[PDB]
């Protein structure tokens, strides 16, 4: 009652490891709002220059 | 411990002070809750900790000269943590284990198997478990208040005892010799009270026995060779015990043992370890925060010699049936023994 | 503070000992290996024990470990204050410290024991770059090696005088 | 109603959310009898062992603000929810103070006996020197809180906190109490049972205060009687001090005096500051806040401030803040955080603690 | 010819430089009609007078008193002139400054005394057990003490202070002497008791053993010959008595024992030096020369102190007057008289010239 | 006979020229009662009633009395030497100010009256014991850790960085991590104590967060330590957490970066041509580089900063702690190095205007 009833009230974030991480891509610099990224269980694709 | 958990092991012999890197049992990846020796086997201990497991160990007849994280066996059933274990009185290699998830469940260790499983039994948390006098049923304490009488073999309801104890407060529940269930609890006003009940009439009471109104739950500890139950509250600084007999009121408050210090936990000696020539009736290990503290219970006797009537034929190291034979269903007394041998 | 001084004597032969000047192979036998110090007759001044001394030139010769005839240098039942120049080998340096030792036995008398003591804390303030101090007030706190050893560097010390532990 | 508890080493302040000042206010104490009984409780909490003080041994559950003995600490908060307050503490929130840097294995039981033992609702830790800078009403500040066990100096800027500027002094209230005694023999009163410390504590209270210039109170004490004082012992006996007023206290600007090689109250605060960035030490200057009740004595804001302008530059404003509260400064910033309306996305549930355990505990707070 | 006077909290011993012992030692008491008695005068006359400690507990609470010991002490015990002499004086740990100026008042311009000194007791026993660091735990009449000292200097911050000593045990001794049968009340019983204390009293190593053993036979029994020829027996109260140093509970007493004590000011001195003050634990007083004591404080402490460190008592034989022996022989030094407060420098700097020259 | 003077924030070590080893090490500590003065291991052993005090902070003096007390206690106290009798070879820190070089040079030849004397960059020694003119050098020491590239024997003063975050920085974050698990250090003499466990049983972790997961979830990683008094107290994380603050200096609430980023940031201000063989020449040394692990959490570290052409190669000798003072020997032996000596005599008639030149 004095709190609202949640599962998700204490998820917190956490980055990952620099060794799991993607260094040296050229993200793009188009001015346009968009996600730039787009990732399935298989690939990850990233818009660059 | 610092991480994980563990429990000390030493032999009776290292009094004094205790080094801080002496070997301790640590193969638990959560604290340890409960721990109890094997009653037909002195070098072997179960364990059940926060990791939802319970891990069986053997102790070298030296005790441990490096520390022990591999167990006998590792005997995983439970879902939440296990802070109740109760080794079988008479079945050989039966042992008990209760955990937060309200399920009991009787196991094998020679094996590795699960018995039984008793899941739909308690509703809510369970506080302790005790065998009988010969192994064939078990009381249980739950936090809805309710005392509960359950044969593991056939999974069925013996008796039960709604609302046991009015508090709200932790309360427990053991076996006595002669079969009936004392059990200690808390009033609606919050005061501490011990009871005493029939399985074959649960309506009433025998006796209901008010100490004070202190905080702290009561942990029995029951003696069946004297019938003198011993009770020890968490917190306190003071041992009550009490004779239970056939005549009313059936609960007769002999002595107080006070100290000055509270008590973190209790350990009593089985009849077996007492030094029977000095009238020693129960030796108590009264647990401090950082020391542990023999406590000696003598029956003052102007006589030197044995105490035939002190001291009747008690249950011994070794064991009746087996895992198989008690699972088929035979039920058989612990074999009794003599401790005049044990006189110097 | 008894006030007992301590006599240029004493202060001469502490800077001989503890400073090393470049000096030829013979004079460097002549270097104190060993010194006792005791109270003048007036017991006024403190004053170097005669022929109570160990050189470095009889270690090896006429002597082969120096802590050991150094202690039998001690009187049984009468207190002194002692220099010894340690040579011991640390597991990653070899050190040479100077020691200085108080020899309180039990079986000296008691004016003896008490005017040492009350005098301790101002010779030694004198003999300054000291630091090592043994205090020993029985022969069983000094005889052994080991003891020594553990004043010097604890349980670091590999070696003493050239020799294992 | 949320509950505030400010569990302190000598004293223990509860009372509900939104209130002006605490319900409760008890020594943080467990008695035990020492004689025995020959007319036909094995303990004493509070001020009913105060009371019955001439035949019980006090002992304090908090010693230099770490947790000695764990089963008279519940005690002390068994008897704040149900003998003080009077009321269930399954059915309202508790609102936890902890000193700074606490230690997260006291912060873990803390808040396990909670859920556990009390079957509270909701449970939140924040950290005293924060409160004392909500009561009064300020974002930038160094607060400088001395209860009975130890001396905390947290310097906040802007509601941001600095963990590496924090120090300790292991000096207050208890340690100027058994001082108290050390010199009180000095003029032939003994003071030795646990329960004297009572009687030269209320003593203290009383009669102390913090002189601007050492050496001159001592040379107007020792050739006029202007500076002496009598207090009436609970027997009837009257005793008289004189330069003990103020030399106790001063044991907390001079830490020479019980041996202490750390520095005085007044340079604890001065190394905090020059601990932070520079660009934050002007405003840190200006907001000195102190809490606790060993700064309630007569002048020590004065000496304070004369202390602190000596250490920092001459052209820096040297303000002492002392709110006339500032013995309940922790609870009074305890209620009025868990009164705001954006406090209640902090609150712990028990259930939630249950399926997670301490981890979320240690997160969601500083 | 300089003078040694060792104002104890009981017992006043005096003497002359260079001598082995104390040449008066009486206690130091005041006695007024209940027209002032002072020492074994006090104590001649029983019970028609009152008695007063004006030392009773190491640190001087009455001047005015304190002066009539010192001219005894002088004129009918040393049996000298004071002015012609030089005094030394000793003072008990944690003396405030105010009495070492107040002393150095009194003797300079009421006894006239060419020079005088002050010093510490707990200092001058550790000096005379041969030692300058090390833990002193001086037990005498009125008081307990244990003072740690490092380098010849006390630690005012880890001195801590008893109210339990030989006083307490005289009283303990005659009231378990009444569970015998015997009366002692009167205040020259009070005499004989101590006189027993001294002479049969003995410390147990086991206390519940040596109980054991008492009540199971008469070879603890001891027989002790009143001064009008009454012989009384005492069994186990020979031990009991001098239990209640390591167990005040017996008297009613909340604070610790005083092997507890000594172990509390060791460890409130620090770390790096507690070592030393383990393996250098001195015994001093009257109250200490009871037998078995040092066994029995060396079993106490090991069972508190950690099991790496050795734990070693010093029981010197001649420790009841340690403290005077050491001062004596401080007196009877060529080297020491340049140390002596002149009255020529008293008059420059009054009074206050006994903290930079005495510390 | 040359003497080989190495003065440190805590350790100042001293010996002969020739020979392998510092002959003598001493804490640089100067002690005073509380209750005149104690140095080195004096004060170490007196400590208990001590107030102990640094005359080097961070690498700056703070009193120069003090820091004549442990010159005159290095000659007289230790070396048991003359040093009028002596050429002494002084050590000085990278980027070292004129005005702190200035006073060196006055005291040893007023003070000391030191025939002759010369003065040599830390990291420039640190390489000759590696046997090397080609490198980067991470001197991490008491007061202050700096990252000087060498190419070829050539000094580039431009790409020195200097971290403020050193050993005696770790000996205060274990201090305050120690009062977590209940044990208080607060004056100069529980320092020492604490700098002792932190010599004994502290390391660097390859991975902090999974060294975290099994010391919360395991009993391996706990070890015992003694106090001079007697009491045994345990540790468990600390063991890992206080070296952790090398590669994360936000533990302490500094902003700068970790000790391998300083490396690599250091190779990156050199010129392009050079940094393939600095990166193959990374060269640790001081007091606080001898953690265990310390050579392979740095070479995973700047591995994963350099490019993944170039081949990481951290040279960790096991006597690095002692480099710069075998560095010193070596070269007060070479013959090339009598050219170097600053004489008394041609001093007193110039100045330090001789100094400043004939170094670097
Ligand atoms: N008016 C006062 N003058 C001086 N000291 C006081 C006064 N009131 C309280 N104290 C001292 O402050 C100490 C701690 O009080 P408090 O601030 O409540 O500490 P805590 O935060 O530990 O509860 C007490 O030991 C008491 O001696
Ligand atoms: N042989 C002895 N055995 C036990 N107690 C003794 C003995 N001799 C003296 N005492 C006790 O010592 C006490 C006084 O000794 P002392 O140390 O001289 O007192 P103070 O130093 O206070 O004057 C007396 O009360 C006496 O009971
Ligand atoms: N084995 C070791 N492990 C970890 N740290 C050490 C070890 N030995 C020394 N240190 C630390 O290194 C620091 C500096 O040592 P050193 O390199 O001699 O400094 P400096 O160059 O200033 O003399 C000391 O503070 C000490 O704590
Ligand atoms: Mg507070
Ligand atoms: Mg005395
Ligand atoms: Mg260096």
Same mark, same amino acid.
């Given at each position: 009652?004095?709190?609202?009833?949640?599962?998700?009230?204490?998820?917190?974030?956490?980055?990952?490891?620099?060794?799991?991480?993607?260094?040296?891509?050229?993200?793009?610099?188009?001015?346009?709002?968009?996600?730039?990224?787009?990732?399935?269980?298989?690939?990850?694709?990233?818009?660059?220059? | 411990?610092?991480?994980?958990?563990?429990?000390? #092991?030493?032999?009776?012999?290292?009094?004094?002070?205790?080094?801080?890197?002496?070997?301790?049992?640590? !193969?638990?990846?959560?604290?340890?809750?409960?721990?109890?020796?094997?009653?037909?086997?002195?070098?072997?201990?179960?364990?059940?900790?926060?990791?939802?497991?319970?891990?069986?160990?053997?102790?070298?007849?030296?005790?441990?000269?490096?520390?022990?994280?591999?167990?006998?066996?590792?005997?995983?059933?439970?879902?939440?943590?296990?802070?109740?274990?109760?080794?079988?009185?008479?079945?050989?290699? +039966?042992?008990?284990?209760? /955990?937060?998830?309200? +399920?009991?469940?009787?196991?094998?260790? /020679?094996?590795?198997?699960?018995?039984?499983?008793?899941?739909?039994?308690?509703?809510?948390?369970?506080?302790?478990?005790?065998?009988?006098?010969?192994?064939?049923?078990?009381?249980?304490?739950?936090?809805?208040?309710?005392?509960?009488?359950?044969?593991?073999?056939?999974?069925?309801?013996?008796?039960?005892?709604?609302?046991?104890?009015?508090?709200?407060? @932790?309360?427990?529940?053991?076996?006595?010799?002669?079969?009936?269930?004392?059990?200690?609890?808390?009033?609606?006003?919050?005061?501490?009270?011990?009871?005493?009940?029939?399985?074959?009439?649960?309506?009433?009471?025998?006796?209901?026995?008010?100490?004070?109104?202190?905080?702290?739950?009561?942990?029995?500890?029951?003696? @069946?060779?004297?019938?003198?139950?011993?009770?020890?509250?968490?917190?306190?600084?003071?041992?009550?015990?009490?004779?239970?007999?056939?005549? @009313?009121?059936?609960?007769?408050?002999?002595?107080?043992?006070?100290?000055?210090?509270?008590?973190? !936990?209790?350990?009593?000696?089985?009849?077996?370890?007492?030094?029977?020539?000095?009238?020693?009736?129960?030796?108590?290990?009264?647990?401090?925060?950082?020391?542990?503290?023999?406590?000696?219970?003598? +029956?003052?006797?102007?006589?030197?010699?044995?105490?035939?009537?002190?001291?009747?034929?008690?249950?011994? @190291?070794?064991?009746?049936?087996?895992?198989?034979?008690? #699972?088929?269903?035979?039920?058989?007394?612990?074999?009794?023994?003599?401790?005049?041998?044990?006189?110097? | 503070?008894? %006030?007992?001084?301590?006599?240029? %004597?004493?202060?001469?032969?502490?800077?001989?000992?503890?400073?090393?000047?470049?000096?030829?192979?013979?004079?460097?036998?002549?270097?104190?290996?060993?010194? &006792?110090?005791? &109270?003048?007759?007036?017991?006024?001044?403190?004053? &170097?024990?005669?022929?109570?001394?160990?050189?470095? %030139?009889?270690? %090896?010769?006429?002597?082969?470990?120096?802590?050991?005839?150094?202690?039998?240098?001690?009187?049984?039942?009468?207190?002194?204050?002692?220099?010894?120049?340690?040579?011991?080998?640390?597991?990653?340096?070899?050190?040479?410290?100077?020691?200085?030792?108080?020899?309180?036995?039990?079986?000296?008398?008691?004016?003896?024991?008490?005017?040492?003591?009350?005098?301790?804390?101002?010779?030694?303030?004198?003999?300054?770059?000291?630091?090592?101090?043994?205090?020993?007030?029985?022969?069983?706190?000094?005889?052994?090696?080991?003891?020594?050893?553990?004043?010097?560097?604890?349980?670091?010390?590999?070696? &003493?005088?050239?020799?294992?532990? | 109603?949320?509950?505030?508890?400010?569990?302190?080493?000598?004293?223990?302040?509860?009372?509900?959310?939104?209130?002006?000042?605490?319900?409760?206010?008890?020594?943080?104490?467990?008695?035990?009898?020492?004689?025995?009984?020959?007319?036909?409780?094995?303990?004493?909490?509070?001020?009913?062992?105060?009371?019955?003080?001439?035949?019980?041994?006090?002992?304090?559950?908090?010693?230099?603000?770490?947790?000695?003995?764990?089963?008279?600490?519940?005690?002390?908060?068994?008897?704040?929810?149900?003998?003080?307050?009077?009321?269930?503490?399954?059915?309202?929130?508790? =609102?936890?103070?902890?000193?700074?840097?606490?230690?997260?294995?006291?912060?873990?039981?803390?808040?396990?006996?909670?859920?556990?033992?009390?079957?509270?609702?909701?449970?939140?830790?924040?950290?005293?020197?924060?409160?004392?800078?909500?009561?009064?009403?300020?974002?930038?500040?160094?607060?400088?809180?001395?209860?009975?066990?130890?001396?905390?100096?947290?310097?906040?800027?802007?509601?941001?906190?600095?963990?590496?500027?924090?120090?300790?002094?292991?000096?207050?209230? *208890?340690?100027?109490?058994?001082?108290?005694?050390?010199?009180?023999?000095?003029?032939?009163?003994?003071?030795?049972?646990?329960?004297?410390?009572?009687?030269? *504590?209320?003593?203290?209270?009383?009669?102390?205060?913090?002189?601007?210039?050492?050496?001159?109170?001592?040379?107007?004490?020792?050739?006029?009687?202007?500076?002496?004082?009598?207090?009436?012992?609970?027997?009837?006996?009257?005793?008289?001090?004189?330069?003990?007023?103020?030399?106790?206290?001063?044991?907390?600007?001079?830490?020479?005096?019980?041996?202490?090689?750390?520095?005085?109250?007044?340079?604890?605060?001065?190394?905090?500051?020059?601990?932070?960035?520079?660009?934050?030490?002007?405003?840190?200057?200006?907001?000195?806040?102190?809490?606790?009740?060993?700064?309630?004595? $007569?002048?020590?804001?004065?000496?304070?401030?004369?202390?602190?302008?000596? =250490?920092?530059?001459?052209?820096?404003?040297?303000?002492?803040?002392?709110?006339?509260?500032?013995?309940?400064?922790?609870?009074?910033?305890?209620?009025?955080?868990?009164?705001?309306?954006?406090?209640?996305?902090?609150?712990?549930?028990?259930?939630?603690?249950?399926?997670?355990? $301490?981890?979320?505990?240690?997160?969601?707070?500083?």
């Amino acid at each position: 009652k004095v709190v609202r009833q949640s599962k998700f009230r204490h998820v917190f974030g956490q980055p990952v490891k620099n060794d799991q991480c993607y260094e040296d891509i050229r993200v793009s610099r188009v001015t346009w709002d968009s996600t730039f990224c787009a990732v399935n269980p298989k690939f990850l694709a990233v818009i660059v220059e | 411990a610092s991480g994980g958990g563990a429990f000390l #092991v030493l032999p009776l012999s290292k009094t004094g002070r205790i080094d801080k890197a002496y070997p301790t049992v640590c !193969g638990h990846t959560g604290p340890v809750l409960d721990i109890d020796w094997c009653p037909h086997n002195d070098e072997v201990i179960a364990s059940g900790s926060e990791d939802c497991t319970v891990m069986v160990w053997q102790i070298p007849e030296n005790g441990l000269t490096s520390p022990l994280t591999e167990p006998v066996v590792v005997l995983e059933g439970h879902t939440k943590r296990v802070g109740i274990i109760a080794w079988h009185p008479t079945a050989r290699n +039966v042992l008990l284990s209760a /955990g937060c998830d309200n +399920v009991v469940l009787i196991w094998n260790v /020679g094996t590795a198997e699960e018995l039984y499983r008793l899941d739909s039994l308690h509703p809510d948390l369970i506080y302790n478990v005790s065998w009988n006098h010969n192994g064939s049923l078990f009381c249980s304490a739950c936090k809805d208040k309710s005392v509960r009488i359950i044969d593991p073999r056939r999974g069925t309801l013996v008796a039960e005892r709604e609302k046991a104890h009015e508090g709200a407060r @932790p309360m427990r529940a053991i076996f006595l010799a002669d079969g009936k269930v004392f059990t200690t609890g808390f009033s609606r006003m919050s005061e501490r009270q011990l009871a005493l009940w029939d399985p074959e009439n649960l309506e009433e009471p025998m006796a209901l026995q008010e100490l004070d109104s202190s905080n702290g739950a009561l942990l029995p500890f029951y003696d @069946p060779d004297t019938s003198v139950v011993y009770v020890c509250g968490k917190g306190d600084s003071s041992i009550r015990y009490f004779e239970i007999t056939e005549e @009313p009121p059936y609960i007769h408050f002999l002595n107080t043992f006070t100290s000055k210090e509270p008590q973190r !936990g209790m350990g009593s000696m089985p009849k077996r370890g007492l030094e029977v020539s000095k009238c020693e009736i129960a030796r108590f290990y009264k647990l401090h925060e950082r020391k542990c503290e023999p406590i000696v219970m003598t +029956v003052p006797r102007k006589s030197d010699l044995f105490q035939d009537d002190l001291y009747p034929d008690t249950a011994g @190291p070794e064991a009746a049936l087996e895992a198989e034979e008690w #699972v088929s269903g035979r039920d058989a007394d612990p074999i009794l023994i003599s401790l005049r041998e044990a006189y110097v | 503070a008894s %006030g007992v001084a301590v006599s240029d %004597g004493v202060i001469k032969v502490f800077n001989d000992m503890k400073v090393r000047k470049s000096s030829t192979p013979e004079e460097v036998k002549k270097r104190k290996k060993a010194v &006792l110090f005791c &109270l003048s007759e007036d017991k006024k001044n403190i004053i &170097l024990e005669e022929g109570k001394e160990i050189l470095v %030139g009889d270690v %090896g010769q006429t002597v082969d470990d120096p802590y050991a005839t150094f202690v039998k240098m001690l009187p049984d039942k009468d207190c002194r204050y002692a220099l010894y120049d340690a040579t011991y080998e640390t597991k990653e340096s070899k050190k040479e410290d100077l020691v200085f030792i108080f020899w309180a036995p039990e079986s000296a008398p008691l004016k003896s024991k008490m005017i040492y003591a009350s005098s301790k804390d101002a010779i030694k303030k004198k003999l300054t770059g000291i630091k090592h101090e043994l205090q020993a007030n029985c022969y069983e706190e000094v005889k052994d090696r080991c003891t020594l050893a553990e004043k010097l560097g604890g349980s670091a010390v590999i070696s &003493l005088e050239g020799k294992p532990l | 109603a949320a509950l505030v508890v400010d569990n302190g080493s000598g004293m223990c302040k509860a009372g509900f959310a939104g209130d002006d000042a605490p319900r409760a206010v008890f020594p943080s104490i467990v008695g035990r009898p020492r004689h025995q009984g020959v007319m036909v409780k094995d303990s004493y909490v509070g001020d009913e062992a105060q009371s019955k003080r001439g035949i019980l041994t006090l002992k304090y559950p908090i010693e230099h603000g770490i947790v000695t003995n764990w089963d008279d600490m519940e005690k002390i908060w068994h008897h704040t929810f149900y003998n003080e307050l009077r009321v269930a503490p399954e059915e309202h929130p508790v =609102l936890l103070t902890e000193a700074p840097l606490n230690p997260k294995a006291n912060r873990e039981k803390m808040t396990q006996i909670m859920f556990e033992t009390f079957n509270t609702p909701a449970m939140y830790v924040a950290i005293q020197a924060v409160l004392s800078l909500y009561a009064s009403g300020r974002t930038t500040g160094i607060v400088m809180d001395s209860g009975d066990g130890v001396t905390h100096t947290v310097p906040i800027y802007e509601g941001y906190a600095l963990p590496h500027a924090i120090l300790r002094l292991d000096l207050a209230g *208890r340690d100027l109490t058994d001082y108290l005694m050390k010199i009180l023999t000095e003029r032939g009163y003994s003071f030795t049972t646990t329960a004297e410390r009572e009687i030269v *504590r209320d003593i203290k209270e009383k009669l102390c205060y913090v002189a601007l210039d050492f050496e001159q109170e001592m040379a107007t004490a020792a050739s006029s009687s202007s500076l002496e004082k009598s207090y009436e012992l609970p027997d009837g006996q009257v005793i008289t001090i004189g330069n003990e007023r103020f030399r106790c206290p001063e044991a907390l600007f001079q830490p020479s005096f019980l041996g202490m090689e750390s520095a005085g109250i007044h340079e604890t605060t001065f190394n905090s500051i020059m601990k932070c960035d520079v660009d934050i030490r002007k405003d840190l200057y200006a907001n000195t806040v102190l809490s606790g009740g060993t700064t309630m004595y $007569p002048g020590i804001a004065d000496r304070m401030q004369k202390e602190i302008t000596a =250490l920092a530059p001459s052209t820096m404003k040297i303000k002492i803040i002392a709110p006339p509260e500032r013995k309940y400064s922790v609870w009074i910033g305890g209620s009025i955080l868990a009164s705001l309306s954006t406090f209640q996305q902090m609150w712990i549930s028990k259930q939630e603690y249950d399926e997670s355990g $301490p981890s979320i505990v240690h997160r969601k707070c500083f």
